[PDB]
Symmetry: none
């Protein structure tokens, strides 16, 4: 159970990283 | 392009909330 | 609107991180 839950956090976290990579490229870029 | 980022953010939001429901649930009842 | 996107991002990051210290509470005993 915990592993499944950490799994999810880590996959969202990747996704928030993705989008964040995109914004700060538009802004000042 | 703003709209695309906008949709994406909203889908990330729905996911976290689902995750936060899971956590409140084990954590609270 | 572009700033708005930026604040919505910090707030889901921040929240992801608060969920993690929550999961962590649950596991750690």
């Amino acid at each position: 159970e915990w592993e499944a839950l950490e799994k999810k956090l880590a996959a969202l976290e990747s996704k928030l990283q993705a989008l964040e990579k995109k914004l700060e490229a538009l802004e000042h870029g």
